[PDB]
Ligand binder design. Structure first.
Ligand SMILES: CCCCCCCCCCCCCC(=O)OC[C@H](COP(=O)(O)OCC(O)COP(=O)(O)OC[C@@H](COC(=O)CCCCCCCCCCCCC)OC(=O)CCCCCCCCCCCCC)OC(=O)CCCCCCCCCCCCC
Ligand SMILES: CCCCCCCCCCCCCC(=O)OC[C@H](COP(=O)(O)OCC(O)COP(=O)(O)OC[C@@H](COC(=O)CCCCCCCCCCCCC)OC(=O)CCCCCCCCCCCCC)OC(=O)CCCCCCCCCCCCC
Ligand code: BCL
Ligand SMILES: CC[C@H]1c2cc3[nH]c4c(c3C)C(=O)[C@H](C(=O)OC)c4c3nc(cc4[nH]c(cc(n2)[C@@H]1C)c(C(C)=O)c4C)[C@@H](C)[C@@H]3CCC(=O)OC/C=C(\C)CCC[C@H](C)CCC[C@H](C)CCCC(C)C
Ligand SMILES: *[C@H]1O[C@H](CO)[C@@H](O[C@@H]2O[C@@H](C)[C@H](O)[C@@H](O)[C@H]2O)[C@H](O)[C@@H]1O[C@H]1O[C@H](C(=O)O)[C@@H](O[C@H]2O[C@H](CO)[C@@H](O)[C@H](O)[C@H]2NC(C)=O)[C@H](OC(C)=O)[C@H]1OC(C)=O
Ligand SMILES: CCCCCC/C=C\CCCCCCCC(=O)O[C@H](COC(=O)CCCCCCCCCCCCCCC)COP(=O)(O)OCCN
Ligand SMILES: COC(C)(C)C/C=C/C(C)=C/C=C/C(C=O)=C/C=C/C(C)=C/C=C/C=C(C)/C=C/C=C(\C)CC/C=C(C)/C=C/C=C(\C)C(=O)O
Ligand SMILES: COC(C)(C)C/C=C/C(C)=C/C=C/C(C=O)=C/C=C/C(C)=C/C=C/C=C(C)/C=C/C=C(\C)CC/C=C(C)/C=C/C=C(\C)C(=O)O
Ligand SMILES: COC(C)(C)C/C=C/C(C)=C/C=C/C(C=O)=C/C=C/C(C)=C/C=C/C=C(C)/C=C/C=C(\C)CC/C=C(C)/C=C/C=C(\C)C(=O)O
Ligand SMILES: COC(C)(C)C/C=C/C(C)=C/C=C/C(C)=C/C=C/C(C)=C/C=C\C=C(C)\C=C\C=C(C)\C=C\C=C(C)\C=C\CC(C)(C)OC
Ligand SMILES: CCCCCCCCCCCCO[C@@H]1O[C@H](CO)[C@@H](O[C@H]2O[C@H](CO)[C@@H](O)[C@H](O)[C@H]2O)[C@H](O)[C@H]1O
Ligand SMILES: [Fe+3]
Lengths: 58, 273, 55, 62, 39, 335, 60, 58, 58, 60, 39, 39, 39, 56, 58, 39, 39, 39
């Protein structure tokens, strides 16, 4: 499978990968931090039974 | 990658600060010391904007709104939830826009070009610096800056306009609008003329400076010439931003009534008082 | 129902029947803002529609 | 009747489709000089692929 | 461009780092799940 | 370092251009001349103009339009020549009253307005034809008349949108401050034009036109010492001035135009300013009557905390009426 | 593992790393200082039994 | 079928394809995370009969 | 009608077709997703008689 | 009739034709979709006797 | 460009394809009419 | 540029891909129809 | 560019990777359907 | 660690470091200066038991 | 320590230093003049007991 | 450029510096967790 | 650039300036802590 | 340009002037503290 590194220069792929994973990681953390349930800075010490849950159907 | 003629031009030299240390490229981009500082301020400022969105009511791109502090904080830094985040982002934006201008100077120096582009961009930086620094400082509170939000800043523009009842009557605003409209006309004329001599109808030779000067002459009654139209375009576009900065800095710090009643001086000239 | 029950023996807040260590506050987004649901909801907060003109 | 879709929304997406088409056209035009790009991995075009380099015919004078 | 020997040598490190990263992420998810499960 | 912002040494030529390129029918009007002041900033020749049939008729039709406007403005200050100059920016020739709809109105109540609008419109169309014929006579592409057609399109929407809503009263008054009063009241009537997305787009291209001409003006001046202002030769016979211009922007922002294609970016940004503008005007009052509420529906409008809250009896009390007719009597209140 | 420095110039990997860490460190501090629980400049002296904890409304 | 790779450079197509799939996946996730029924961060622990449902005909 | 591939370069036509189908599918899906009757992410689990219908003539 | 293809390049015409037909088809569909009578996505299941009709002469 | 011999056969395809499209559209209008007549 | 042979060979794949696409679309429409018909 | 033999080698990887990805996505949809069906 | 200066010639980067430190110090002072607890220009004389705490 | 002047041109350093100190002095004076406690142009004659103080903890 | 011996020498410093920095960060988190834990 | 013996000599001063600066800062923090503790 | 001797001379002045400035500024702070102390 290594011949993928003949089609693509590893120096370029690792730059693309580090860029992609940096953006994706920051996206997910900020999305969670914006939520009610996973606003862990304000509420991280609540237990699972105490954490918010989004409104159910009637 | 490089343009087919590019490699010859990629010498060292022309930096302002870093010397050879940062004197390299990343893909197409020149880096340099102000490239490093640019990316620092861009990344910090962007991630703080994303944090502002996260702690606001929505992720909808149009509705995100990072607002300045209340006027009661004066020239202090407010609590970050309360506008201090806007104040930090404003510092990053100043750092980024300044870094971008100085990086352009390093690039112009390395190519042996004149410094026109860095200074023309200074007209935009001036207008931004007027809106978020100079005018708020003269009014005595950072809370007079505009909010960072794609539509919420348009709500700010609307309300600032009607703070003077009928902002169209602002005389510097009339000049600034005239420059923006004249610029867009001149851009369409210059773009059209160059394309019309380089892309004449099929079966026609490529045109010449003489033909575009002849056409331009019977459009405006005078021929502006090749250097002249570029001087004019620079004058109109940058002059619009400079008159924009004037029109907003006079509104509040120097004039407080409605703008229509500013024109009372004209009615009272003694030849017809 | 604007605040969670308090344990009288400690002053400690009870969430879902169990104590929390700390001063509880109700979380909200910046300045308590909430995005507008609908035109119908925005209009429901305004005055009624104007009466017809007198001509 | 359609509650959400309206003629201003329809017209706006018609413009977006045109505008992105225009940006593609302009970027093809931007690549008539200096392309294909030199690189250590051989020639590179980017995207979209540039229009060909254009020859100009001068006049025979009078 | 790389020799196929060099591609072979790079691929071993690339797989090993990817595996390591996936392991750390898998532990991170199971800690998050134990504290506050999302389903 | 020389900035190339003004010309310290002009040269005259005693014979001159201004005698046109071979042009066929019509006549070259006047003899060419030099202005030393024009020669400081640009090329010095102020000189001969071409009209042909379409140019002559355009000036006749346009002059009448200008006379009708000015005479009505001057009549509106009772023929006072002092008040005509003193009050000039507040004077208008004003569109018809709303109750006429599209019917012909009385002469002093918008009849002169529709006449001036008609002759101005014919004059603008005849000027477009004059430009189109001249571009072809000089053996040029048609880029300029189509750019001018974009401006004419926006202008025509100040006729078609009043037509579509069904009243000439909605048209723009001829007058300096009065047409700005209309511009503000249009945004008020239709519930804040900032939330019209084609207005937002039109601004994006208006600003972009300033961005591009600032960038392009500065770029060419920055390479003008290397002949970069000889743009046609830099297009047909690329020199180092073009190469440096491409490399500057490539190294700055990661991509670049060519010496030709920057003029296409320029052309489309200017043209799209008025084209998107016209679409936004045509949609206003015909498809959308309150752009802020259209913004709320489509999620444009940022939320703010409530500044007041109405009770249900206030909701009935604070509804007004739509504005009606003015009182056509002077009531006595004595009993 | 050390041949990563033959692929990339260490002089500028170190610049990019230090800059990333500075940006990251400043973000996390400004994020914490924005919170109520960790607004340490105003409330850092509160003991953990007094420190804020965010909850959802009960809305019973 | 393989002659398609004589029409198109596989190095370019693979870059195009990864770009398309990344954008498409992000769009689909954000559409779902905007919704009521699939706001899984806030409500993902609800059972399938507790999850929100849009209105029926009356 | 294969001479159409002599008339037009198949590399350009096939990219044109892919772009056309991509745009058209996205348009139709988003139109349906903005309707009431076919807002399937919120209401896909409703039975056919429970799904919304627009008003009749009176 | 075929000498029309000597005046006009069929490679231009077929593109211009496809463009016109695609625009025209989309215009007609969206005009109908915006109507009351033919908003078929929301009301397509209504029978022809119960689909909306514009109001007749009002005897005003 | 093209010869008249080429224009001859292109016209044959062009006329046929046009008529086929008009035929398919005729069925679509037949179906649309049967579902919901516009007159 | 294609030979007429390459054109005629490519056309066979293009017809086959179109058919496969229309088949999938037909199944998809009938699944859609039986879940929530639009007429 | 490629020889036909290189194009054939790449096609094997491309088809296998495409079908592999669709299988992984098929399990993702199986899991998602069992958690919260959308019809 | 002295070999760092063979990567980064100090005459080209001391003005970098000093510029970084000066801005960072100014930011920290302004952050403190307009907090309630540390607005020392207005309230520096209070003493620790009288100084504000920003409790919820 | 004096070899620092072999790295940097004193003519430029002394300008940069004097500029920095001038800006810094001007800022500190403006910060004090804008305060309540130290707005000395208006309240400078007040005794140290009479000068303003910010609010205590309630 | 730099040799494999230079790369290896640099790598040893670089790994050590990273691990030392990570150790210092670990103690900072130990202190912060003692002051005000976040779970 | 400079030689290693220059770099060692410069490093000696730079380290000592760093320690001096940190010592002043350490006293500044302990004065501040004495005046108004932040934990 | 500069020399060891030239640098030493300038350094003597630069150090002396800096310390002289800081001495005068310390007396200004003494006067300000006497007038209206800030802690
Ligand atoms: C968005 C905002 C609005 C703004 C919005 C607009 C944004 C505009 C920017 C858009 C991106 C532009 C990308 C670009 O131009 O790249 C040029 C480059 C050049 O290709 P090349 O010339 O052929 O190859 C270069 C390479 O061979 C040699 O690179 P060099 O040696 O010169 O430089 C090294 C790089 C970084 O090095 C690395 O990343 C690898 C490090 C080792 C990784 C080891 C594995 C780690 C595993 C984890 C273990 C973990 C445990 C140990 O950096 C430099 O030194 C150059 C200077 C960088 C700039 C200065 C930075 C200053 C400090 C501040 C930094 C702040 C934080 C960024 O191209 C490539 O490498 C290939 C393409 C790379 C794509 C990168 C972007 C991908 C983003 C994907 C997001 C997708 C979202 C949907
Ligand atoms: C409403 C009125 C609007 C009014 C304002 C409208 C503004 C319009 C102008 C801006 C858009 C054009 C930007 C551009 O062309 O940059 C050159 C870049 C690549 O150049 P290349 O010559 O084709 O290829 C170079 C490559 O072969 C060799 O380079 P190297 O090996 O050294 O480095 C690797 C490359 C890898 O490429 C990338 O990383 C792409 C980065 C992002 C591309 C743009 C994505 C969309 C916009 C940004 C979204 C993310 C933004 C946060 O690295 C580079 O080449 C980096 C240099 C390019 C940096 C471009 C930065 C543009 C930022 C635009 C910001 C727009 C803000 C609205 O081009 C591309 O990557 C493809 C661009 C295709 C045209 C864009 C429009 C597409 C419309 C949608 C069609 C369907 C999907 C494509
Ligand atoms: C000229 C070469 C030296 C010098 C040589 C001496 C000598 C010799 C003596 C002092 C002494 C003192 N110096 Mg010294 N001093 C210098 C620079 C300084 C600087 C400075 C910012 O650079 C400062 C703040 C001081 C400060 C001081 C005081 C600690 C002390 C006496 C009080 C004083 O301030 O007098 C005011 C002085 C100044 C503000 C600046 C210096 C002015 C002139 C050049 C020296 C005046 C000396 C004074 C008249 C004493 C005479 C002693 C008899 C000759 C025996 N000096 C220069 C660099 N200094 C005396 C001491 O140790 O007392 C305890 C002492 O005998
Ligand atoms: C792409 C959008 C921008 C745009 C573009 C644009 N405008 C254009 C063009 C272009 C590309 C032209 O080529 C065209 C032009 O000619 O430019 C010089 C024009 C033009 N843009 C104009 C104006 C204009 N453009 C504006 C805006 C814009 N123009 C947009 C920003 C605005 C604004 C912002 O409000 C204005 C006011 C004109 C200067 C010109 C069209 C001139 C025209 O049509 O004139 C008609 C004639 C008259 C009104 C009559 C004049 C009467 C004389 C004074 C009478 C003298 C006596 C006479 C001799 C009597 C007759 C006797 C006979 C026997 C001879
Ligand atoms: C003069 O007449 C005009 C026209 O009616 C009045 O203006 C009306 O009211 C305004 C709200 C509106 O802007 C305008 O369009 C118009 O609708 C104006 O105020 C004056 O009013 C007095 O005269 C009225 C008149 O029409 O002559 C009279 O109206 C009443 O009497 C007439 C018969 O004389 C009858 O036809 C009307 O139906 C009747 N209307 C009402 C409401 O009573 C006003 O009398 C009263 C009580 O309103 C006059 O008003 C006064 C105070 O004298
Ligand atoms: C240089 C050329 C540039 C061209 C750019 C085109 C961009 C923008 C303009 C497009 C025209 C917009 C027309 C707007 C009117 C409109 O929408 O009125 C709709 C009917 O629908 C319609 O008329 C549908 C309108 C569809 C418009 C055409 C789309 C298809 C072609 C796209 C081509 C793109 C590439 C070129 C009514 O709306 P309503 O709210 O009253 O309905 C509900 C009532 N209760
Ligand atoms: C909010 O919810 C939303 C976000 C919307 C939901 C959606 C989410 C979506 C769509 C997510 C998609 C995620 C994804 C998709 O694939 C994620 C894919 C992730 C992947 C693949 C990660 C891979 C990481 C690999 C790493 C870390 C490798 C490290 C390698 C190292 C250390 C060795 C380097 C080489 C060396 C040292 C050799 C030198 C020797 C040489 C050179 C020699 O010796 O020659
Ligand atoms: C709000 O909450 C949000 C923010 C959203 C939550 C999310 C946060 C996220 C996603 C965080 C991610 C963090 C992260 C991810 O990887 C973090 C990764 C961090 C890393 C890798 C740190 C590495 C540090 C390394 C250092 C310091 C190295 C120092 C080296 C030194 C000192 C020696 C240099 C060598 C010399 C001097 C020798 C020269 C000799 C030469 C030349 C010779 O001899 O030749
Ligand atoms: C919410 O956010 C907020 C509130 C902001 C919170 C978060 C804050 C954060 C994250 C802060 C981080 C701070 C930080 C991180 O590293 C801070 C790092 C600070 C550092 C490194 C300080 C180091 C200083 C070193 C100095 C002063 C050295 C001076 C040396 C001198 C004077 C000698 C010069 C040389 C000579 C004389 C010899 C010439 C001889 C020659 C030439 C010869 O002999 O040849
Ligand atoms: C003796 O000569 C004197 C001294 C009087 C000459 C001096 C004259 C002066 C001083 C003139 C001053 C003029 C000024 C200051 C004019 C200002 C004009 C401005 C600012 C106008 C701004 C906007 C106007 C707009 C947008 C108007 C648009 C009008 C349109 C599109 C009208 C179209 C009308 C049509 C097509 C009419 C058709 C006729 C039919 C019968 C079909 O009716 C509908
Ligand atoms: C679902 C829809 C079902 C109905 C669709 C019907 C579409 C029409 C199918 C017609 C099939 C036969 O169509 C016929 O093909 C032949 C051979 O290709 C074309 O023949 C064409 O090319 C040949 C040479 O190749 C010329 O000699 C001839 O003059 C020219 O017309 C005809 O122009 C066309 O009439
Ligand atoms: Fe130009």
């Amino acid at each position: 499978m290594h011949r993928i590194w003949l089609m693509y220069d590893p120096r370029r792929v690792m730059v693309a990968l580090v860029g992609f994973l940096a953006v994706l990681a920051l996206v997910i953390h900020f999305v969670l931090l914006s939520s009610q349930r996973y606003s862990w800075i304000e509420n991280g010490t609540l237990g699972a039974d105490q954490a918010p849950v989004g409104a159910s159907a009637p | 990658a490089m343009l087919s003629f590019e490699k010859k031009y990629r010498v060292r030299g022309g930096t302002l600060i870093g010397g050879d240390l940062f004197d390299f490229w990343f893909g197409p981009f020149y880096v340099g010391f102000f490239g490093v500082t640019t990316i620092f301020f861009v990344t910090l400022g962007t991630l703080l904007c994303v944090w502002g969105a996260a702690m606001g009511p929505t992720w909808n791109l149009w509705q995100i709104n990072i607002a300045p502090p209340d006027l009661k904080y004066g020239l202090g830094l407010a609590p970050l939830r309360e506008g201090g985040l806007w104040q930090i982002i404003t510092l990053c934006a100043l750092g980024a826009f300044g870094s971008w201008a100085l990086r352009q100077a390093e690039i112009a120096r390395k190519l042996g070009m004149g410094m026109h582009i860095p200074w023309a961009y200074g007209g935009a930086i001036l207008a931004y610096t007027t809106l978020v620094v100079i005018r708020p400082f003269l009014l005595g509170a950072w809370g007079h800056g505009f909010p960072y939000g794609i539509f919420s800043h348009l709500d700010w523009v609307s309300n600032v306009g009607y703070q003077y009842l009928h902002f169209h009557y602002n005389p510097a605003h009339m000049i600034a609008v005239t420059f923006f409209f004249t610029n867009c006309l001149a851009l369409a004329m210059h773009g059209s003329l160059i394309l019309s001599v380089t892309n004449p109808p099929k079966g026609t030779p490529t045109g010449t400076s003489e033909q575009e000067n002849v056409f331009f002459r019977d459009l405006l009654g005078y021929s502006i010439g090749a250097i002249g139209i570029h001087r004019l375009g620079l004058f109109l576009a940058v002059g619009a931003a400079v008159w924009s900065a004037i029109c907003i800095v006079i509104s509040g710090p120097f004039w407080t009534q409605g703008w229509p009643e500013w024109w009372n001086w004209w009615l009272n000239l003694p030849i017809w008082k | 129902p604007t605040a969670w029950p308090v344990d009288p023996t400690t002053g400690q807040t009870l969430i879902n029947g169990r104590p929390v260590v700390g001063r509880v506050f109700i979380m909200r987004k910046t300045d308590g803002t909430v995005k507008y649901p609908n035109v119908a909801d925005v209009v429901a907060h305004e005055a009624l529609a104007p009466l017809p003109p007198v001509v | 009747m359609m509650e959400y879709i309206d003629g201003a929304q329809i017209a706006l997406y018609a413009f977006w489709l045109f505008f992105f088409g225009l940006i593609i056209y302009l970027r093809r035009e931007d690549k008539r000089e200096g392309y294909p790009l030199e690189s250590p991995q051989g020639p590179r075009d980017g995207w979209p692929k540039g229009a060909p380099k254009k020859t100009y015919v001068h006049r025979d004078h009078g | 461009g790389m020799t196929e020997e060099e591609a072979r040598r790079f691929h071993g490190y690339m797989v090993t780092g990817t595996l390591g990263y996936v392991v750390v992420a898998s532990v991170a998810h199971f800690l998050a799940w134990s504290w506050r499960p999302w389903f | 370092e020389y900035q190339n912002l003004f010309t310290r040494v002009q040269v005259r030529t005693v014979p001159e251009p201004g005698i046109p390129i071979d042009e066929s029918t019509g006549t070259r009007y006047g003899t060419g001349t030099f202005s030393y002041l024009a020669g400081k900033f640009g090329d010095a020749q102020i000189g001969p103009i071409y009209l042909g049939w379409a140019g002559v008729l355009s000036l006749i039709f346009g002059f009448i339009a200008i006379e009708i406007i000015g005479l009505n403005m001057w009549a509106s200050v009772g023929w006072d020549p002092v008040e005509f100059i003193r009050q000039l920016p507040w004077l208008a020739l004003e569109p018809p009253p709303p109750q006429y709809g599209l019917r012909v109105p009385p002469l002093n109540q918008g009849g002169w307005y529709l006449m001036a609008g008609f002759f101005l419109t014919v004059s603008i169309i005849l000027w477009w034809i004059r430009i189109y014929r001249r571009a072809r006579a000089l053996q040029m592409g048609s880029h300029l008349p189509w750019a001018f057609a974009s401006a004419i399109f926006l202008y025509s929407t100040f006729f078609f949108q009043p037509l579509l809503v069904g009243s000439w009263s909605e048209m723009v008054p001829f007058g300096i401050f009065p047409h700005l009063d209309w511009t503000s009241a249009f945004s008020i009537r239709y519930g804040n034009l900032y939330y019209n997305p084609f207005h937002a787009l039109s601004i994006a291209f208006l600003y972009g036109s300033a961005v591009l001409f600032a960038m392009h003006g500065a770029t060419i001046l920055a390479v003008a010492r290397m002949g970069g202002e000889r743009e046609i030769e830099q297009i047909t016979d690329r020199g180092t001035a073009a190469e440096r211009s491409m490399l500057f922007w490539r190294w700055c922002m990661g991509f670049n135009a060519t010496m030709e294609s920057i003029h296409r970016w320029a052309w489309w940004f200017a043209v799209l300013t008025t084209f998107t503008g016209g679409i936004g005007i045509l949609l206003t009052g015909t498809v959308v009557d309150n752009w802020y509420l259209w913004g709320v529906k489509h999620g444009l409008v940022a939320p703010y905390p409530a500044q007041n809250q109405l009770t249900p009896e206030q909701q009935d009390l604070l509804r007004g009426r739509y504005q009606g007719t003015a009182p056509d009597s002077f009531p006595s209140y004595v009993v």
